Every structure is written in C-alpha cells, then in structure tokens.
C-alpha cells in the first residue's frame, strides 16, 4: 500500500513515501526535475531504486526541509532506501554493500576561537 | 483553555514542577494535554580569559532559558483547589492567561 523512510544529511530532513505506481516523483508539490535539474548530482537521489531495479514500480511523495539542495538529495537518497527496506527486508542484503542505508555523519565543524574558521590559523610574519 | 508558560534556568526544576501541576490537574480535572517542550533561548557571552591582551584566550559562557507548556483543557473550578498555591520550585517563573 504505502512505505515510509526518513533519512538525513548535513542537517537536512526528507520524508520519503513510496506508493506503487507509474514512477513519477514529487518533491514539495513540484516535479522532481522542477526542484533539481540544473543540478547534475540530482539523479543520484534515485540511485537506491536503480539498485533494486524498482524505478517505474514505485511512485514517490517527498517532503524536504533543511540544508541545501545537495544535502537534500542525499537525505532523499537515504529515505528511499529506508522505505525500500521497510517494503521488503530482503532488500537490505542487496542495499547494504552500496551503503545507501548508511547515514552520513559529516557535519559543519564548529568555529574555534583564535582561528579564522575552525581550522584556518591567522598568518604571521615573525619578521 | 488556561494558557501557562513556565520559564527557568534549570531544566530539572521546570520539568519536575510541571508534572506537579499536571498531576494536580489530572485528579481534579481534564485529560491535561501536558507539557510541550518549546525551544530554548540560549544567550552566549564570550570574554577574554586574561585582564590584559592575550586576545586568543576566550572561554565563553552560556545562559539558557528553558520553556514549558501545560495548557489544561476544561478550566474546572475544582482543579484550582490542588492548583493555585502548592509548590516546591524556587527559580521557576510562571505566566498565565485565559
């Protein structure tokens, strides 16, 4: 009937709803390529489907908020994989070596005092 | 429909003194929708460690205001019995509207 996943990347969340159908994807009411497209990376979001050979089997309704559009792409990429897992658990063993179900823990590193940004040190002369 | 806003510097004190209001209003009153967390207001102060020069020292402090919700449905007059004044908490401040 319907299958759900979340996923997150770089402080961006996406609700991913897989509803069996034609394969047309919706994000925030817009077409998939309305939101993306002008972004080369975009297609990567749908990589889980292409991995399990889903594609035109499931349709998708996706809510997306947080981060920038690339992080949103990765979060979507997770959510699709999670919902896909909830559908058929036997997908996990196929999906895992690609690591699509792996959350990416990389986050903007805090700025530290005395530095310029978080690492970069103020330059000096000494003479 | 009684609006309550609980603010304080101690999350322990707030969270604990809210459930007192809730439990007091449960017996004498409605389902008591219960505390909704609300975001915290964090105020930072960054200050140089030393009295002289040494601009690279810092060590900032933070002062944070936690919030709580309550908001009991069915403002029964029987409820204000266990309610009104019975409380432990000191550094909690309470706001109330209709």
């Amino acid at each position: 009937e319907q299958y759900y996943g979340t996923g997150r990347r770089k402080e961006a969340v996406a609700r991913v709803f897989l509803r069996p159908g034609n394969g047309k994807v919706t994000v925030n009411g817009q077409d998939f390529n309305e939101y993306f497209q002008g972004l080369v990376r975009a297609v990567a979001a749908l990589e889980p489907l292409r991995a399990v050979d889903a594609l035109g089997h499931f349709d998708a309704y996706i809510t997306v908020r947080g981060g920038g559009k690339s992080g949103q792409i990765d979060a979507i990429k997770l959510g699709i994989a999670r919902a896909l897992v909830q559908y058929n658990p036997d997908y996990r063993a196929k999906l895992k070596p690609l690591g699509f179900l792996t959350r990416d823990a990389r986050v903007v590193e805090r700025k530290k005092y005395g530095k310029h940004k978080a690492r970069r040190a103020p330059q000096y002369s000494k003479r | 429909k009684i609006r309550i806003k609980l603010r304080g510097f101690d999350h322990k004190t707030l969270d604990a003194s809210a459930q007192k209001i809730v439990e007091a209003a449960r017996r004498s009153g409605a389902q008591v929708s219960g505390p909704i967390p609300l975001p915290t207001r964090v105020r930072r102060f960054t200050v140089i460690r030393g009295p002289f020069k040494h601009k690279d020292s810092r060590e900032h402090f933070e002062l944070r205001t936690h919030n709580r919700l309550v908001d009991i449905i069915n403002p029964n007059r029987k409820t204000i019995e266990q309610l009104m004044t019975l409380d432990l908490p000191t550094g909690v401040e309470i706001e109330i509207k209709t």
């Binding site: 805090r110 | 510097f9 101690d10 105020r43 930072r44 102060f45 200050v47 140089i48 460690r49 009295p51 060590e59 900032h60 402090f61 933070e62 002062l63 944070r64 205001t65 550094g91």
Partner: protein, 60 residues
C-alpha cells in the same frame, strides 16, 4: 577606575549622549556587558564563583 570618574552615574548628565555605562563592581569603563551591568573580568570571576544564576560553561 578613578574615583572621580564614578561620577558617571548622574541623574543630570546634561546630555543623554554623555551618559556612558561602567562596571557596577570594579568601575571598568570598557567591555561592559549591558545584561549583567558588569565588565568582562568581573563577569568571568563571578561566573566562576557561581554567583550569576543560570550562567554555565558553554561547550559544543
């Protein structure tokens, strides 16, 4: 903090602009946080003694 300069507090500064804040504790002119009314040094000292309610060491 020279003692005559603690004439800072004046109901009659003669102009609103001539009114400047100082540290209520040590009498420091520069680096005076408006929230605490203190200066930065006193701020750190008292914060370390635990005399400023809610003020904690921040890390993240």
């Amino acid at each position: 903090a020279r003692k005559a300069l603690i004439e800072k507090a004046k109901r009659t500064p003669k102009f609103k602009v001539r009114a400047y804040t100082r540290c209520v504790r040590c009498g420091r002119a520069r680096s005076v946080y408006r929230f605490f009314g203190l200066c930065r040094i006193c701020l750190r000292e008292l914060a370390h003694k635990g005399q400023l309610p809610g003020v904690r060491k921040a890390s993240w």
